[PDB]
Point group: D2
Chain length 213, copies 4
């Protein structure tokens, strides 16, 4: 894991019955906790739901970990790691997602599956009324020998107000690593640019681990 | 929809990272609320998780509806209907599932996707310690012009005790149908026979709609 | 526990900051699974929230248990039992409640505490837009040597539609009793009459235990 | 609200049927985001449950708010504010709590009610196996004209591992105040000293508001 790394991904999913495929190519700085990616809808264009529900699915290797907190993710390579996540929205929408992350040369490959169910037809996801995710702080703790992260996430909505989602992600190293004590990862994710129907999206994330107050 | 109907299905899914395909062929009696199916694992054998998590995913057409409760499901054909479901287990395991149900001649075809995440590695699902689902009563109510069913489900476990799961299923007719008032559907599902690793399973369900006490 | 029993109760609670006391006197038939009660607001009249949230707090002794299902509740007397319940509404409202049930002569005394928080100010509870609870089926199972009941409950709302609440009640006998296997209790509760601000309410419940389909 | 303020409180509650009263006296620095309190069990000693479940119930006035984030709490006085909270533990334990906060001279008075239900008898709360709350980051957002804070909280347990609780607190000013945009409050709470059965406890909290990464 070098100061500069490339990223490639493929997501296949279904949300509200709508099948899609998205591919991404980007780059990031693992030790600065930053990454940027260009994403293209390859099947199912135009997506009928809020693109924002996908974006946090598009790798905690890209998080700046201070010396005092063991870095579960960077420690996991070359073998790498996978994660699974549930996203429980406050109106009963539920998404499941996974990523199997491999490293070849200077490039992370991401094999992703995303599924979304029970979104109300007049809700902000199906009506595409989301603006952005707010920054967040993920709570990281060991459970059954692997790392779990829980996050209170919120989408800022058109015309004001927020739409809440609770994330639970289970991260699993493919080798033994030094496990961290309870800690936090601050995140900020943003769509830098997109075209009209989000067929093309440029995405960015900054993340930094810390020990709280 | 005749007194006797055939059923065919294909499920593709991933649970705990493990990819699989299962195909099923069966028959049922829509007006008696009964059905039986033979299921075969076509890819991913042997499944590393409790087969029981799948079984309720393997069609509320097969539910005996009395004259006084509009039958959302039978009314929906020939066009048919689809459903989406989240299954929230008490230990944080979450599954998402969907079925798109079509009718050709005397045969229902079921296109199914199933995804499971966040199952604890020492839990009853990953350790295959489930015996059966208990019978249940699904609560059916209209929400946003479509039908929602919520169920408090429980797996009876090896060595006693239960493992709870909450189902929320959204059922969507592909045409206009007379919508029912709040009602119930009693269910009982059972694996009639299986081989050692559940590569072959014979499954049965009985369901009856009612208006409660 | 005779064919006819009297009931007296006192509830103290706070909902949305509003303190109240309600007292009740009634009668029921334990073996027929029926009871009726007259309730009077003694402090905090007029209640600023939907009275319906209280009613299921105003004793599973009054449930008709068939010979084949051990009756945890009737078995518990003369010593009696207590219960605790959480009520999780779909809009984030949460109530907690408890009842300590004693028997003196032919009369059950009920010491009740009820607390409600996080109800949205424009929601159906604070705006008093509830009509009734729908009938329900409670799922009963043993957990840690005591009985747990889970219920998918729904309030029918003014102008149509439902408002969902999930009940979890833990029932604790004050002596050893034969524990039942997994079973169900059907319920129907209804306000028979009330005055304008629900200062006076006549309430009824019918409940019957069964083994499902 | 001065650089130094006094605090007095009274909590009445019931957890697992066990009634108690606790009184507290302390002091804090509202603009430094710190406070300390001495708490005494006045009724129900010795408490049969983990004292830690109470501690975050023992005032966001004591949070350091930077100039760029409107301070909902400090703005609310002299009239003051109240809050309600639900605490949803991962094993089904649920607590409800409220605080009505008044200011007289240099002293905040806190009228508190706390109720806890559905705690498993062999769980860490009833078995008193909690060590401390981990630091946290509360997510603050406006909803229905008032402020809501959600927190992923975790108790560190004896012998390792964590026990998760999700907090939702609704904060209500008793006058009009400038409402803040989405923000965060970092918290750290600690028991500085206690006697054997927690009849006497010295408690401390540090909290700082921020805008995330």
């Amino acid at each position: 894991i070098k100061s500069d790394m490339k990223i490639k991904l493929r997501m296949e999913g279904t949300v509200n019955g709508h099948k899609f495929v998205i591919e991404g190519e980007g780059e990031g700085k693992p030790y600065e906790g930053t990454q940027t990616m260009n994403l293209k809808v390859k099947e199912g264009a135009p997506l009928p739901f809020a693109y924002d529900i996908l974006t946090t699915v598009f790798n905690r290797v890209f998080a700046k970990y201070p010396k005092h907190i063991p870095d579960y993710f960077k420690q996991s390579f070359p073998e790498g790691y996978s994660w699974e996540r549930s996203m429980t929205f406050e109106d009963g929408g539920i998404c499941t997602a996974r990523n199997d992350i491999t490293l070849e040369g200077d490039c992370f490959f991401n094999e992703i599956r995303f599924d979304g169910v029970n979104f109300p037809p007049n809700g902000p996801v199906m009506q595409k009324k989301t603006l952005k995710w707010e920054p967040s702080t993920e709570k990281m703790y060991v459970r059954d020998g692997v790392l779990t992260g829980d996050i209170n996430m919120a989408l800022l909505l058109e015309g004001g107000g927020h739409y809440r989602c609770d994330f639970k992600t289970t991260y699993k190293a493919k080798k033994g690593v030094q496990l961290p004590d309870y800690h936090f990862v601050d995140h900020c994710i943003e769509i830098l640019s997109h075209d009209k129907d989000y067929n093309n999206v440029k995405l960015y994330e900054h993340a930094v681990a810390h020990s709280g107050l």
